[PDB]
Amino acid sequence: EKHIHFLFNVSTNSLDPHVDMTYIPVRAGITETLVRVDEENVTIAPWLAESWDSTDGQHWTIKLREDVTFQNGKEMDAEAVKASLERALDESVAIENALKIDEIEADGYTLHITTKEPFPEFISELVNPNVSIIDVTEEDFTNHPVGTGPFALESFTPGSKLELVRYDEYWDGASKLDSVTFSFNEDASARSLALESGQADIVYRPEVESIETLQANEGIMVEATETFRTHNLTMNLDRDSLKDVNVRRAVDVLLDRQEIVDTIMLGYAEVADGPFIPTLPFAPSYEKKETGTDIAIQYLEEAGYTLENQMQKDGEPLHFTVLTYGSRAELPLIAQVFQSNAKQIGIEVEIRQIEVPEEYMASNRDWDLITYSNVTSPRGDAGYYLNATYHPTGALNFSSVNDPELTGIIDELNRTVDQDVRAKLTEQAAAYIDEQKIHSFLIHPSAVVAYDENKVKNWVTTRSEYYMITNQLDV
Ligand SMILES: [Ca+2]
The missing domain is CATH 3.40.190.10 (Periplasmic binding protein-like II)
Known part of the structure; x- marks a missing residue:
């Protein structure tokens, strides 16, 4: 039997x-x-x-x-x-x-x-x-x-x-x-x-x-x-620091994604080059990038920040308050690693362990980044995610994200029935979200x-x- x-x-x-x-x-x-x-x-x-x-x-x-x-x-x-x-x-x-x-x-x-x-x-x-x-x-x-x-x-x-x-x-x-x-x-x-x-x-x-x-x-x-969920640093573009493309680009490099796969996930996970897993029909090919404490300095430099005696532009210190939370125990560890790399490069991070993601609307104000997590393509479609996280009206939009080119795409995308074109539009929104570095995508657990x-x-x-x-x- x-x-x-x-x-x-x-x-x-x-x-x-x-x-x-x-x-x-x-x-x-x-x-x-x-x-x-x-x-x-x-x-x-x-x-x-x-x-x-x-x-x-x-x-x-x-x-x-x-x-x-x-x-x-x-x-x-x-x-x-x-x-x-x-x-x-x-x-x-x-x-x-x-x-x-x-x-x-x-x-x-x-x-x-x-x-x-x-x-x-x-x-x-x-x-x-x-x-x-x-x-x-x-x-x-x-x-x-x-x-x-x-x-x-x-x-x-x-x-x-x-x-x-x-x-x-x-x-x-x-x-x-x-x-x-x-x-x-x-x-x-x-x-x-x-x-x-x-x-x-x-x-x-x-x-x-x-x-x-x-x-x-x-x-x-x-x-x-690989699963459909992705970990990321979700950014807050209502903050001046982050209104800069290169300031974002830089945060995007401060964490060494492989070390998260190994020192924290134990190997029970994969590098994310983006919100969507590579095998999806609408995932971009991405240029293969080097990303450490060194490469951070170069972007933060292009943006207009040098380290004096503390990273700063003009007269004001560069710093971020990175929220994190309990529900997922590897997230707070990414938080603590981020602040360890920040400081090597001139930046102080207040790590604040919030409970719930409700805080973003309420605390609103203060926060620069959060060690966050989404399922981005729950059953092969990314329309809900994208709209929710990126469109001006989006339910989950908490980073005050509002880029008209992007909104352009999400708009056609929401008015689009045909599976193959829904596919074409999502790759573009993906691509565009890369170029403009709207968040930092860390891993795929x-x-x-x-x-x-x-x-x-x-x-x-x-x-x-x-x-x-x-x-x-x-x-
Ligand atoms: Ca039988």
Whole structure:
């Protein structure tokens, strides 16, 4: 018998893919979405749906595959998909408010969806594991979701494990796995042990101090992958210091990104050359740059700052107040390293450990930089991020960022339906954000997986982090 025990990060007492928020239904391979993020190109690809169109971004048309069936056997047709979408809008306010769906008419396998208003980024919302398609003619959602995954649910123990049996008629080709145990444990080293003791085959996010021990075990492999989140120093352009391009350029060099990968992240991360990961279809190639305490001086010089007896221009000291916070324990360390480099070069930094990012609007005033963090391309689209962080009106715009050329692009971008041009515009906004150095992008933290190399075949660690248990896995 072919069995895989996968031991997961996070627990849950529900398997309602609509209320859940842990995305476990999709993670354990019960459940799937109309549309996915392709592992090869990192773009929005059809899964449950074959294709889509929108002349105008408001009237959307989705053709679905004619060959899919739910685990219980029933056909998956537009009506079924209507039901599921609907059950999902009437059950989660988050889903309701994000999908923006006015109406959904059904016929055969095509669907007609009308968003409240033109929603160019509508399709990318269907990637959300939340909107995974389930059979609604099947009542026990907390404990028994019936979806289209390669694994049907056998049994469920809230707060503990779930049990899954291969589904024999899975539309994309049946697992060779006889069965999977998908279980949860919130303690990182408990996880490490479980793998070591051989009580688990695959562990997600194993302990960082231990990672050294396991790795070394004869037969255990650890993979790591780039995620969509990026760490950065977010700047405050309402400050005169930073209104200068070269003052920014300089901050951008004061930190040695590789040393963050190693001295702090421990290797559990990758250098960011920007907000977007290289593999994305809309990421720029970047000139490969040298960046240390030396190179800082040169930019700060061009800007008009020399070190006298303290960096200064004219009569006033150069300094920054760099906020940081608790929620992410490596951030305060980047903070402390930044101030250690600042001082080598003439600059004092007040490191202020704030709690919450609300402070930026309230404290408003004082602060120059914050050791911050965003997911920039949550399901292959960067339109929300960019608009939020860069457009004058942007919800998250706290650096009083307002560059009309940029706003130019974001504007066309928000009025643009076609996936390939959305792509072209994002590269430009990216490019432009580089040239003008609007923030400093430090690292991309890694999702990390460890597993028994000799039992487990074809584990892929996915960037979206939505995909873990899948038909491809074997023992
Ligand atoms: Ca069977």
